[PDB]
């Protein structure tokens, strides 16, 4: 998790399931 | 006065309709996605 890294109707959703959970 | 001021959007998200099948009830949540419970 360290390696890997809201303005025109583009939004981002929420993956369903939070990191804690997977 | 010469200062620093941002800019944001307004707030947008699109409104989701939670429903338990209209089989059962006529009561729905409702989900405003990514806004700060105020401008409802
Ligand atoms: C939905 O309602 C119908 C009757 O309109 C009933 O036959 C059915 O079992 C209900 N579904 C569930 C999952 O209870
Ligand atoms: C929501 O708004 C309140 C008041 O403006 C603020 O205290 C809080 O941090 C905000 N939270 C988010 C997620 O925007």
Same mark, same amino acid.
Do not use: H, R
């Given at each position: 998790?360290? *390696? &890997?890294? *809201?303005?025109?109707? !583009?939004? &981002?959703?929420?993956?369903? !399931?939070?990191?804690?959970?997977? | 006065?010469?200062?620093?001021?941002?800019?944001?959007?307004?707030?947008? %998200? %699109? /409104?989701? /309709?939670?429903?338990? %099948?209209? +089989?059962?009830? +006529?009561? /729905?949540?409702?989900?405003?996605?990514?806004? +700060?419970?105020?401008?409802?």
């Amino acid at each position: 998790f360290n *390696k &890997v890294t *809201k303005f025109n109707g !583009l939004t &981002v959703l929420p993956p369903l !399931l939070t990191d804690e959970m997977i | 006065t010469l200062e620093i001021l941002d800019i944001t959007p307004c707030s947008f %998200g %699109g /409104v989701s /309709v939670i429903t338990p %099948g209209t +089989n059962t009830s +006529n009561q /729905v949540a409702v989900l405003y996605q990514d806004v +700060n419970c105020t401008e409802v």
